[PDB]
Structures are given as structure tokens and as C-alpha cells.
């Protein structure tokens, strides 16, 4: 089995889901898989380029293997959840950042 970063050619008998844009989904394109907001994007992939990689060496865009539309992968949004409070020797109310 060769498992190279090159575009894949020998694929499992998988379902072929409909594409959804602008919502968070757990994608798998040609066996390359992750989670993100998928958006169609302006990025001028040359016709021989099959995906985009970032300054971080992360996968950043892909070309759907059933439609040559350039999907940007933006990670599903995240952050620290901080609690603002007076002392419990004043009130049990809180606000959340």
C-alpha cells in the first residue's frame, strides 16, 4: 500500500455524501479527513493542484473530487471560556466570557 501526499486513485467503496457549504462538518475527501467550516473560495489553484497547504504546513483548501470547486477549510470555531465573578463572599451571580 502506497499512502503518499499525491492525489489518491484506489479507493474504498464509500457512500459519496452531498456537499454542504458554510456549516461545520467532519469531512473526508479522497481519504484526506478533518473537521471544519467549508466555504467555496477565490483561490486560483492551477488545474494540476489538488489541495492547498498553509504557512503552518496544515491542509487549508481542497478541490472536491466530484466537482472542481475550491473549498477553503476553516477550523470549527473555538476559544477559552472564562468566568467573571465578585467573591463568593458577595454574590453567586457570574458573567461568562
Amino acid at each position: 500500500f502506497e499512502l503518499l501526499h499525491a492525489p489518491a486513485t484506489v479507493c474504498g467503496p464509500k457512500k459519496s455524501t452531498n456537499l454542504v457549504k458554510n456549516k461545520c462538518v467532519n469531512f473526508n475527501f479522497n481519504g484526506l479527513t478533518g473537521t471544519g467550516v467549508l466555504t467555496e473560495s477565490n483561490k486560483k489553484f492551477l488545474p494540476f493542484q489538488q489541495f492547498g497547504r498553509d504557512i503552518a504546513d496544515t491542509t487549508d483548501a481542497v478541490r472536491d473530487p466530484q466537482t472542481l470547486e475550491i473549498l477553503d477549510i476553516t477550523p470549527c470555531s473555538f476559544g477559552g471560556v472564562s468566568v467573571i465573578t465578585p467573591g463568593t463572599n458577595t454574590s453567586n451571580e457570574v458573567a461568562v466570557l
Binding site: 501526499h5 499525491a6 489553484f45 492551477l46 494540476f48 493542484q49 489538488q50 489541495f51 492547498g52 483548501a61
Partner: protein, 40 residues
């Protein structure tokens, strides 16, 4: 005949798009400013 190869024979090293980066890689390239042979 031997002739200058300057700044030539670069190619996209893989099928990956990479906008706005100074990427770096080890691969088979024409050495810069070496000699290409010329024929007739």
C-alpha cells in the same frame, strides 16, 4: 557545445497549492548557473 543554464528548470515540486510562502524542499532540480549542453 556547452552553454549557461541560469535561473532555469524550476518546476512545481508536488500537486499542492501554496500561496504567499517561501517554501523549501529537497528534490531533483537543474543546478543554477551550471552548463546545459547545446545540440545541432
Amino acid at each position: 557545445a556547452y552553454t549557461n543554464s541560469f535561473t532555469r528548470g524550476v518546476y512545481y515540486p508536488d500537486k499542492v497549492f501554496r500561496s504567499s510562502v517561501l517554501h523549501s524542499t529537497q528534490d531533483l532540480f537543474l543546478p543554477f548557473f551550471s552548463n546545459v549542453t547545446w545540440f545541432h
